[PDB]
């Protein structure tokens with residue numbers, strides 16, 4: 062299974078052995094100026110405007126549905 | 139042990155239940171406050187998804203990535219980091235932050251040798 | 252909402268609207284969804300066949316309408332339709348539906364603000380699956396089979412002859428389909444597009460009638476070219492004339508022993524002018540094709556110029572008279588890898604050379620330098636610091652000689668005489684054995700590094716890169732072919748439906764068996780005298 | 781080497797590579813040979829050489845052969861004794877061995893591509909045809925007298941003649957039973 066296992070496991074060991082470095086660098090990063098990611102705090106339902114921290118993605122095609130979700134726009138200025 | 143069930147699903151490494159907890163989209167309106175995935179907007183086959191991401195990011199004590207990636211016991215850490223709230227968050231820590239420190243800590247320890 | 256939509260049209264909504272907002276987005280993947288901004292295309296883009304069935308029955312609907320980008324509706328379906336197979340694939344089903352609902356041929360002749368027909372836009376965007384429809388498009392009707400691109404010559408049981416309308420397809424107009432498929436670099440699946448029947452047999456016929464014989468001709472010229480540089484410089488028949496000059500044209504030379512020296516000077520200048528024009532053309536291709544193709548334009552040009560600069564160096568007589576010649580001769584034999592295209596497995600081996608040298612040698616070399624320089628410092632204790640027993644009497648370079656005598660082992664050109672020390676040769680060789688075993692494991696993993704779907708991917712992608720890197724040569728040869736006497740392919744101009752006898756240029760095929768049907772197509776015969 | 785089931789199946793793989801794919805590799809291996817050989821033959825007869833033009837002959841040819849002996853591994857150091865260009869000699873000649881390793885490493889991958897199936901199985905099926913042609917050739921070699929051999933007993937078919945036709949007996953097997961109405965209902969007989 063070098064067609065699969067010796068190649069793929071050596072890839073997945075590597076991604077874990079790089080993702081451990083990245084969280085190690087945040088311990089190395091000083092607490093001041095983590096002015097970074099963790100996107101804008103939009104509403105959830107409730108009365109507070111900023112409810113929670115967020116993360117934005119870009120999902121895609123077929124299996125449409127007539128959506129009833131949220132602010133019906135494009136993301137805004 | 140002091141663990142939330144999201145953290146307990148990560149420490150025990152149960153991947154499939156953790157694909158639900160980090161997504162959890164709820165298409166209702168008495169109780170869509172319990173949902174972890176939201177929507178920014180939807181316009182045909184292009185749509186923007188929003189993740190509630192409270193204990194997920196490395197900003198509190200013993201976060202989810204803190205207890206997935208530093209964990210050694212479980213087998214399928216790679217099957218868990220493929221998931222969308224963990225993945226693009228790891229990519230964004232990579233691109234904005236960790237790529238440039240790694241090349242910086244390269245050129246120091248390479249000029250060292 | 253289909254029910255609410257018909258109310259709004261009955262209430263008088265503008266069906267020919269245009270939404271010119273910032274959702275066009277060159278940064279496409281976020282906030283985008285370009286759909287050509289008309290209400291007709293939006294139902295056409297988002298799998299709404301009944302609303303398209305509703306909107307195109309409205310007589311006020313401008314189906315021929317354009318966009319801010321100049322796009323009509325068939326441009327809009329092209330710019331959306333993904334190269335995913337059968338996503339209950341609606342766009343090809345609905346591209347089919349719009350032309351058959353309405354329209355003359357005067358809808359795919361419409362160009363955008365780039366000047367592209369929707370066949371060309373499907374090729375430039377590289378949407379393969381919609382382009383398998385446009386180039387086939389057989390229509391088994393008789394109000395509107397004039398819109399069809401595939402026809403039939405005749406049908407007789409399970410043997411039947413197919414005819415392709417082939418207007419903008421062939422390289423006979425400006426910016427044709429093969430012009431914009433094969434020279435394209437942006438899209439991924441150029442090989443998935445050239446497998447298609449109007450493009451394939453047309454590329455085969457340009458290969459067999461035309462490009463095979465020029466390629467062997469341009470082989471035997473550029474192969475006799477490199478023999479001549481070998482037989483001029485490094486021949487020396489008997490006792491040469493006191494360090495001569497290779498490309499010199501001295502007073503008495505029989506006309507077999509200097510015409511080859513003219514043969515170099517002509518065919519180097521013939522190449523130097525040729526890709527010198529490719530400086531004026533290939534401005535964005537070289538950086539975008541950062542590893543794939545068009546490097547061989549450069550390596551031909553660098554080889555041709557350094558021959559000529561060696562002649563310019565003779566007129567000034569600097570020190571690098573011989574230096575610029577030999578790198579021009581060494582690239583000249585290395586340039587034969589461009590002529591390793593042509594045999595179906597030969598370039599398929601040559602692409603695997605180009606894959607490993609570009610991608611994965613620098614992978615292995617960076618690790619192999621690393622254990623070299625790692626054990627080399629470990630070895631250079633045992634030079635200049637250790638016993639050495641007789642040494643500091645040979646040449647130079649304490650660290651450098653310790654590296655090289657550890658670096659000659661990978662050749663196998665191994666020296667024992669560098670190792671004569673005092674009681675540390677126990678510790679020398681068991682160090683140096685752990686070099687060879689460690690540089691065996693770097694070698695053994697290097698074979699496994701190419702492994703990983705070698706049963707499929709390393710073989711098949713090296714084949715499909717080769718077919719694209721040969722199909723780019725063939726269209727390059729037609730630019731090389733002069734405009735007079737292209738009396739060639741592009742078969743006879745038979746009728747379509749209309750009153751003109753010669754309607755369009757054609758291409759004949761030989762389709763086959765089961766799933767019969769009682770045919771109503773064309774002239775019911777065999778092809779004719 | 782026909783005759784053992786895996787022996788010719790190895791021997792056909794010899795006949796496949798020597799006919800098809802050696803001339804593949806040899807045309808590229810001559811190419812980097814003749815490519816670096818001109819690059820090496822600056823460092824013979826044009827460069828330092830420090831003691832040379834006293835040995836045998838052949839300025840370009842000796843520079844080729846001493847670069848051509850490395851593929852054996854029969855490598856000579858004494859051909860390389862020059863002046864300060866042996867820095868540039870060996871790092872040229874290393875880039876010969878690495879380049880003629882990649883030609884060697886891709887040569888293993890050149891036989892790869894469905895070696896799990898096609899290179900093994902086709903070399904088996906070519907062998908079975910190339911052994912079955914021998915066997916019918918031996919019957920042309922066998923003289924016509926005493927072919928008292930196979931072609932089993934001539935049992936009836938339906939008709940009035942007892943010996944109807946020549947035969948061949950097999951031993952077919954299990955499930956999908958049926959209540960048979962075929963022939964002489966026995967075991968084959970004394």
Ligand SMILES: NCCOB(c1ccccc1)c1ccccc1
Pocket residue numbers: 076079080219220221224225226228229232
């Ligand atoms: N587009 C993802 C880029 O980040 B991924 C990544 C790439 C290199 C090193 C570390 C992480 C990744 C993260 C989670 C799952 C899979 C891949």
Ligand SMILES: NCCOB(c1ccccc1)c1ccccc1
Pocket residue numbers: 239240242243244246247
């Ligand atoms: N305080 C220790 C810093 O060392 B660094 C380091 C730490 C662990 C492993 C390798 C290197 C470092 C990190 C980034 C850039 C430069 C150096």
Ligand SMILES: NCCOB(c1ccccc1)c1ccccc1
Pocket residue numbers: 445446447450451452454455458718721722
């Ligand atoms: N019978 C096809 C021969 O031409 B094909 C071809 C063969 C060698 C080099 C270039 C092209 C071909 C053309 C299109 C798709 C696939 C193969």
Ligand SMILES: NCCOB(c1ccccc1)c1ccccc1
Pocket residue numbers: 465466468469470472473521522525551
């Ligand atoms: N005017 C330049 C002609 O060079 B030819 C050429 C052009 C590009 C790459 C290689 C060779 C050529 C073509 C066919 C036959 C012989 C030579």
